[PDB]
């Protein structure tokens, strides 16, 4: 019996400065944050309708630069889907995606975790990562790729909604 709307626990991961917080705040507040305030851990919530189903997104916004914590592994165990974010002007953030994916596969002990690859800051002219490279990486992992800008709001809804659709397909 229906006791309230379905809830989805999403975790936003990726290197320092790629725009994880900016993406989340654009989704929740329709606000672009220009300042860089490094995150340790922040929790957000939003009700949306995706494909005719009302649901609640519980979003955990993570730290880019973090050593081994068992506290980190805990929320990666409970998270049901992961936005893996790099910045299209930062090649290192793109190469770090492999490390986030491995970390997630290890803690969930699974090959088939709901995930979306997100290439953020697509409004900047200093692209160093081609769309095609990122699409090929996503195709090799069997996951969707979405280009976003927290500043223009391009792809922001889509990134989160796509992840929810991936979670739904997985169960
Ligand atoms: N032009 C542009 N700037 C962006 C975009 N997303 C984020 N930024 C900028 O990049 C900086 C870092 O954004 P922020 O969301 O804090 O990064 P983060 O990944 O949450 N960092 P951390 O892991 O330290 O928490 C900020 O100055 C922000 O305004 C984007 O899509 N376009
Ligand atoms: C442990 O690993 C996870 C992993 C992923 C998401 C979550 C999650 C995020 C936010 C909330 N909830 C929440 C969201 C925003 C606020 C802030 N309030 C001021 C509204 C409080 C709770 C949540 O609750 C079940 C779960 C937990
Ligand atoms: Mg942040």
Numbering used by the authors: -3 to 167
Paper text:
The RAS family of oncogenic proteins is important as therapy targets because of the frequency of activating mutations in almost all major cancers. All family members function by signal transduction to the nucleus of cells via interaction with effectors (such as RAF, RALGDS, and PI3K) that catalyze phosphorylation of downstream proteins. When KRAS is bound to GDP, the protein is in the inactive state and becomes activated by nucleotide exchange from GDP to GTP. Mutant RAS proteins remain in the active state and hydrolyze GTP at a much slower rate than wild-type (WT) RAS.
We used these analyses to design of cross-over compounds linking the common diphenyl-anchoring moiety of PPIN-1 and PPIN-2 to the Abd-7 aniline fragment. All three compounds showed very similar binding modes to Abd-7 with van der Waals contacts to K5, L6, V7, S39, Y40, R41, D54, I55, L56, G70, Y71, T74, and G75. Ch-1 was found in four of the six KRAS169Q61H chains (A, B, C, and F); Ch-2 was again found in three of the six chains (A, B, and C) and Ch-3 was found in four of the six chains (A, B, C, and D). Thus, by combining the anchor constituent of the PPIN compounds with the aniline fragment of Abd-7, we generated a compound series showing good electron density for the entire molecule when bound to KRAS pocket 1. While the interaction of the high-affinity WT iDAb with RAS was minimally affected, even at the highest dose of compound (i.e., 20 μM), both the lower-affinity–dematured iDAb and CRAF binding to RAS were progressively impaired, starting at the lowest dose of 5 μM. Phosphorylation of AKT (downstream of RAS-PI3K signaling) or phosphorylation of ERK (downstream of RAS-RAF signaling) was determined following EGF stimulation. The PPIN-2 (and control Abd-2) had no effect on the levels of phospho-AKT or phospho-ERK even at 20 μM (addressed using Western blotting), but we found that the three cross-over compounds caused loss of phospho-AKT or phospho-ERK, as did the previously described compound Abd-7. Structural comparison of the six chains in the asymmetric unit show that compound binding has a minimal effect on the conformation of the switch regions in RAS protein.
